[PDB]
Design a protein around this ligand. Sequence first.
Ligand SMILES: [Ca+2]
Ligand SMILES: [Ca+2]
Ligand SMILES: [Ca+2]
Ligand SMILES: [Ca+2]
Lengths: 174, 174
Amino acid sequence: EFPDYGFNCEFGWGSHKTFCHWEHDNHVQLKWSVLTSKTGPIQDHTGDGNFIYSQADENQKGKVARLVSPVVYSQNSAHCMTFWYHMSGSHVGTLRVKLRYQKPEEYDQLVWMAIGHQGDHWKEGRVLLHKSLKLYQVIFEGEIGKGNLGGIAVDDISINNHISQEDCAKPAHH
Amino acid sequence: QDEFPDYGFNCEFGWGSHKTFCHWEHDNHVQLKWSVLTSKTGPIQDHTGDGNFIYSQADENQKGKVARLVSPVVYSQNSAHCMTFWYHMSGSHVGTLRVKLRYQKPEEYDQLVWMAIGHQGDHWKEGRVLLHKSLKLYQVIFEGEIGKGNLGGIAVDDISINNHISQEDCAKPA
Ligand SMILES: [Ca+2]
Ligand SMILES: [Ca+2]
Ligand SMILES: [Ca+2]
Ligand SMILES: [Ca+2]
């Protein structure tokens, strides 16, 4: 199959919500919720209904949640990170992917970003996890929008693919 | 006129036991056909969607024969379109992949516009072909020439017209 890197996450199934080996960042005010949704317009039909969610809420506007991956095995190969996201609504918020390094000190490098409405359906995002001797973790950062309908969903984060490096990158269409 | 791609041209080849060529058709004058496979195991899969794809197996006994899949008519009188697709060609003798434009009757002819021969890499790659503006209408052909390889084959997936790529960006090394 593929090596057990501990990196992938579907966020479980109906009788089991999980963040796998990912962790909530303790430098920010909110965290991502794991939902099981078998109703309404945002669902995980392929994976028995579980995803993470950052609800738009004018009262929480501009606070962030950050989910932080295990350290990426980045030394021999690059990886293509794929994930799915759902950002419907004009004030749904902002989703950023960052690479967190340790060594000058701990700092974040912005590599992917989607601001506001992206469409009324799930979309595929991809980010190349470049080869690097300097070690890093991946961060999914949800910034709460002012809308009062919906929010940012993310699901099915994976490096289990054989996608060429040059074609990996799939930015947000805004 | 302007929504034709989603009427059978754009094709992911279905999902699970829904195996489909959308509105693409087998050329019947030719000996072999492409097959739709469901992603189960092995290194060739539509991993990111858990989806289907098309495949032309290498087989030394059919070396040099072709399977030909023929698109619906492209409406090209008013504009060019960027067609993107994915392909997987691993093995020195995996065969040859050709994209042709078959211009409409009378005075039908086939114009070759994209060809890959032999080993391209152990991973999915993205092809791009600019479907030029033309008064004479045409169909796109995906043509798989059987390699003499004993393992593997040419896989293709996720053919689409993407009108947000400009003509200069409708190209590899990009
Ligand atoms: Ca899921
Ligand atoms: Ca899913
Ligand atoms: Ca597919
Ligand atoms: Ca795919």
